[PDB]
């Protein structure tokens, strides 16, 4: 009987994506910050917005959830997004295919190190 309607949800998703560093786990603490960073006309609503704030923020710290985005996770993901090595596994470190790769080389008139490994007929 206490389901949170759309407007409290839409307000809550706004604050999480704008001041995620500024939220705190304690409900009373982040209740107060909703005062001057958001315009809530009724005190009861201000409680509820903070109410879903705690629910969302407790979830977000224990792994990011879809529907939430902010700068910190964008850059933190981007830190995984710059994993590029000098070289890579596909290399001349040792074509090992059936006989068709032997016919693959002489087709165009080029020289390749043909080392064929037969595939089962």
């Amino acid at each position: 009987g206490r389901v949170r309607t759309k407007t409290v949800k839409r307000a809550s998703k706004a604050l999480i994506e704008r001041y995620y560093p500024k939220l705190t786990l304690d409900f009373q603490t982040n209740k107060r910050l909703c005062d001057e960073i958001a315009t809530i006309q009724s005190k009861r609503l201000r409680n509820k917005i903070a109410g879903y704030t705690t629910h969302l923020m407790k979830r977000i710290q224990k792994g990011p959830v879809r529907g939430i985005s902010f700068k910190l996770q964008e850059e933190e993901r981007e830190r995984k997004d710059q994993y590029v090595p000098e070289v890579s596994a596909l290399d001349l470190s040792r074509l090992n295919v059936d006989n068709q790769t032997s016919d693959l080389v002489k087709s165009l008139g080029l020289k390749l190190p043909l080392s064929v490994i037969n595939v089962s007929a």
Partner: peptide
């Protein structure tokens, strides 16, 4: 064309 640098070595073929 395409250079000769596009072979499938048996180490990564065995990986495949």
């Amino acid at each position: 064309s395409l250079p000769a640098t596009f072979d499938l070595t048996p180490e990564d073929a065995q990986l495949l």
